[PDB]
Amino acid sequence: SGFGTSYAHDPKWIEDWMARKRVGVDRMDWFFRAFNRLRLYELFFKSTPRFYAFMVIGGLLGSYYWSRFWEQYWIRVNKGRLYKDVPYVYPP
Amino acid sequence: GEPAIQSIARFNPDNFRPVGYAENIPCPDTCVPEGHLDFRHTRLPTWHADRRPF
């Protein structure tokens, strides 16, 4: 309360919010365990030359397929309105 | 009647303090007051999985 004055103070709900520290709780650990079973750290990240190779090779293949995906997205949104989708009929 | 050396000694800038100084100056014992988040609350449980790979 006291919003907009020199008496402004945190409301009770903001104070209750900050009383929930969630100490000891870890609800997203499952994701890290599962990611660690991919062995990306032991195989690529740990060694600098291999980390560089992951960024390069992963950026080569990622860039190509990202383009591929968004090309298909475009071909679908604009179906029937693209030059390839409407062969031209020559006048007689 | 005081000796002059004693009189001027009382006017050292250290001998003057504002009234109510000891009853008003905040004397902090920490930079993280009670109820504020710190590493004790944010530490992961000891059974957590390695966070380096991610």
Number of other CB atoms surrounding residue B49 within 10 Å:
19
DSSP-derived secondary structure for B3-52: -HHHHHHTTSGGG---TTHHHHS---S-SS-TTS--HHHHPPPTTPPPSS
3-state SS of A15-70 is: HHHHCCCCCCCCCCHHHHHHHHCCCHHHHHHCCHHHHHHHHHHHHHHHHHHHHHHH
Task: Give the closest of B37, B45, B50 to A36, CB-based.
Answer: B50
**Residue A72 parent element (H or E):** helix A48-77
- How many whole angstroms separate alpha carbon B24 and alpha carbon A2? 25
A40: distance to nearest CA of chain B, Å? 7
Tokens of A58: 């992963």
- How many whole angstroms separate alpha carbon A90 and alpha carbon A10? 74
User: At which residue do the structure tokens 């902090």 appear?
Assistant: B28
Nearest Cα to Cα of residue B45 among A74, A32, A64, A92: A32
Number of other CB atoms surrounding residue B13 within 10 Å:
6
Tokens of B2: 């005081």
Tokens of A82: 């693209």
